[PDB]
Amino acid sequence: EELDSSNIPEHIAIIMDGNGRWAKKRKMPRIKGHYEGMQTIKKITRIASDIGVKYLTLYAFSTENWSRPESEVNYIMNLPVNFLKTFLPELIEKNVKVETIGFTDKLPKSTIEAINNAKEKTANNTGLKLIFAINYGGRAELVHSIKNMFDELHQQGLNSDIIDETYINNHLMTKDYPDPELLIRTSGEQRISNFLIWQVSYSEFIFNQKLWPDFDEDELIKCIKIYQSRQ
């Protein structure tokens, strides 16, 4: 039917794929697609907020070569620095709370500052939680969470008997958020590329054909409608 405003997913996760491809189709360097992709983030953040989404996890990843995803994980163009610097005022006004998951400790000093300022300035907002997965990988997340949990247990002198599914959820970088009911990936590529592998165990998947730069509010609504129709 039409968009059911009373069944809007609390948490939508999106792999923003297509910036490079979009640029290449127009014989332009990837930076042009990176810029347009940034505009898509603004559009999607506003509409998500306006329809009731409470958590939005975005993973910047551009499929260049299907067999080389490692090149994207820590690539500068997958950073939301430009977005945060040019849209922060709006985020603040829109009651959006900025957060991040991933390994950011080794990012450029000026990058850490930009991200921290964004968080600090929106720390008190109570609306949509805009979560950027930066230099993130599900396997790396688990490996990291496993190491800590082990030390946390040994330090406290305990056995592995307390380790269960719930324990793991509370020790992932996503411990403060419910798992996404819906995972969307643009461009038509159908993989989760090591993104929230544990968290999307029960998520509904939607592989949207449009390139991230062309993805818009209308398309988002359509994805949620599909989500609602599939029950």
The pair of structure tokens assigned to 50 is 């306006």
* 8 Å CB contact between 112 and 145: no
- Whether 50 is a known active-site residue: answer no
Interface of this chain with a copy of itself, residues 98 to 127, rule: CB under 8 A: none
Rounded-to-integer distance, Cα 105 and Cα 3, Å: 41
Stretch touching a copy of itself by CB under 8 A, among 27-35, 76-84, 119-127, 151-159: 151-159
Q: Is 40 in the site for Mg ion (CB under 5 A)?
A: no
- Whether 164 is a known active-site residue: answer no
Looking at beta carbons only, is 40 or 193 nearer to a copy of itself?
A: 193
* 8 Å CB contact between 153 and 162: yes
Q: Which does 126 bind (CB under 5 to 8 A by kind): Mg ion, a copy of itself, none?
A: none
Instruction: Say if residue 210 is exposed, middle or buried (CB neighbours under 10 Å; 0-12, 13-18, 19+).
Output: middle
- Cα-Cα-Cα-Cα torsion 152, 154, 156, 161, nearest 10 degrees, comes to 90
Looking at beta carbons only, is 124 or 229 nearer to a copy of itself?
A: 229
* 8 Å CB contact between 84 and 112: no
Q: Which does 77 bind (CB under 5 to 8 A by kind): Mg ion, a copy of itself, none?
A: Mg ion
The pair of structure tokens assigned to 224 is 């949620």
String marking each residue 64-93 x if it binds a copy of itself according to CB under 8 A = --x--x------------------------
One residue of 10, 64, 204, 214 binding a copy of itself per CB under 8 A: 204
Residues that bind Mg ion (CB under 5 A): 19, 34, 77
